[PDB]
Homo-oligomer: A and B are copies of this chain.
């Protein structure tokens, strides 16, 4: 059939989670750039694909899938050769599902509460409370990492959500190494992947850099 299509932007953290998932699955993704910065997500063809007007959005031969965590689950279920990235055991799957919602309701939400007002609303500060909210999220991630990976002894799509966000926010709200030895060790694991820098590492670094740059530019 047709190559999977991702409506996407490499700077976007949930887009990078899907790109790591694809690489892990040995899937090739056709990327169509939706540039948020020149407003492409609000242009009206894109709004028909996604009424929430967010990226990523998946086009699988006419089946449209919105939302990074739904996209990654969809890809593993349909294109996985096993369920190592997304367990089929109800209990180990619950540990993954709980970690995905941690990423969306805590890690990504708090990051967005910090980045969006700068990238999109023209602000030039990061308030004391935002810093504390984010740093609290780092601490929750540290406490969750009782195992090598976020949702157990094995790497799952919940690791990809988590690192796509953490690698972006770390260079704005500092993640100090000694308060956070478990996160540090975990980053190291994921960096061992052959596709890590390419599918996430650098896009994360660059998003952090870009927010600081646009913030001096807003002050």
Contacts and interface: CB of A to CB of B under 8 A. Distances in A.
A69 B101 contact: yes
A91 B104 contact: no
Contacts of A101: 67-70, 100-101, 104
A97 interface: yes
Contacts of A113: 109, 113
A105 B94 contact: no
A51 interface: yes
B97 A77 contact: no
Contact of A77 (B70, B77, B90): B90
Contacts of A129: 117
A143 interface: yes
Nearest to A145: B51
A117 B129 CA distance: 9
Interface residues of A, number: 37
Interface string A42-69: 0000000001100000000001011111
Contacts of A172: none
A93 B67 CA distance: 12
A63 B90 CA distance: 11
Contacts of A70: 94-95, 97-98, 101
Contacts of A66: 98
Interface of A: 51-52, 63, 65-71, 73-74, 77-78, 90-91, 93-95, 97-98, 100-102, 104-106, 108-110, 113, 117, 129, 140, 143-144, 146
